[PDB]
Amino acid sequence: QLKIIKKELGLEKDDKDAIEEKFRERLKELVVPKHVMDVVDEELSKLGLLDNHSS
Amino acid sequence: QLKIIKKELGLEKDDKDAIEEKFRERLKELVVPKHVMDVVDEELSKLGLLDNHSS
């Protein structure tokens, strides 16, 4: 089913996902406390669901 | 089909009710006084109907 997902990829230009991967890449190197990983994980999930143009 | 696979049955973008659920489960163990046991219920019942982007 995952392959079926990638099979289509008719957009490949998410404006919310690019932000998600940028911040997630920026975070890999650091020795993050789990506290901030748990928080940032939540706020990533909320940024990843929100409308692109809301304040 | 994508929404019925990645968003419905996929592991991404859980429903708002999951947010309700994670709160409810947090309540399931500790014994709250009956007094506040209601208030949370009404807050939930109002909360579900809300548009998520509303402040």
Does residue A12 belong to the interface with chain B, where contact is any CB pair within 8 Å? Answer: no
Rg for chain A (alpha carbons), in Å?
14
Cited resolution, angstroms: 5.6
**DSSP per-residue letters across A1-55:** -HHHHHHH-S----HHHHHHHHHHHHHHSS---HHHHHHHHHHHHHHHHS-TT--
Alpha-carbon gap, residue B55 to B52, rounded angstroms: 8
Torsion sign over Cα B50, B52, B53, B55? positive
Local structure of A52: helix, strand or coil: coil
Dist CA A21 CA A27 (whole Å)? 10
Query: If contacts are CB pairs under 8 Å, which of residues 21-50 in chain B contact chain A?
Result: none
Strands (E), chain B: none
CA proximity to A40, closest of A19, A22, A24, A21 = A24
